[PDB]
Amino acid sequence: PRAPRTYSKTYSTPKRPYESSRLDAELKLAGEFGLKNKKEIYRISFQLSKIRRAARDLLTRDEKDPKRLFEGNALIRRLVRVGVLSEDKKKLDYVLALKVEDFLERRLQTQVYKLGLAKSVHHARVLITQRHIAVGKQIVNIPSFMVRLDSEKHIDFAPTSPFGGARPGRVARRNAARKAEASGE
């Protein structure tokens, strides 16, 4: 007899099982941004579809309708806030446009590579997941973080690990221990 700890799922799965075109395009997307699943694509296209839906429902209301104004704006300022929606096209008919890549480009996965720092979307994966890089002094290790535009400036290696000082790490310290134990005494 406790409150239901509510949940929902975050992806949808394509109606047509075997569409070469869609499998080609999806694959290119995994090899472009360094994803491991078709789920990582499905999940984002699920977000896009719930957005596009609300966008359509709002667009059918009258202009200057109180709900259309209140919720439409919140959605637009929300999409601008993370970096999917450009400043120029800032009036929900572009959110009705949009596409998956605009969402993909904003992942901490893709940003850590984007301003150097990695020079491989995969080196970007392994770096993030391995506790390097952060935003504040706050480490994040989720490839799908999505860089919040105004924290783009704070993508650096973290106070810990190599690449940002503090230590080399038990690999290199083992080798330095092999030099100090073999060559000397």
């Binding site: 080609d24 694959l27 290119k28 995994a30 090899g31 360094g34 994803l35 491991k36 995969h122 994966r125």
Partner: protein, 60 residues
């Protein structure tokens, strides 16, 4: 129709195909890296284009 046919031969062909054991082969990468492998195999450097494209051809 017939319901009491012979039953001796049940399991025949599996029992008389010659056992060939598997072959020890390079370990294939799991997860994202495998997708990478597919991407560079299917799109980056390409393979043949004999008329169009093929994926599992033997001798051609």
């Amino acid at each position: 129709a017939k319901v009491h046919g012979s039953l001796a031969r049940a399991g025949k062909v599996k029992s008389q195909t010659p056992k060939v054991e598997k072959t020890e082969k390079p370990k294939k990468p799991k997860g994202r890296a495998y997708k990478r492998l597919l991407y560079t195999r299917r799109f980056v450097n390409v393979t043949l284009v004999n008329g169009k494209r093929r994926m599992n051809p033997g001798p051609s």
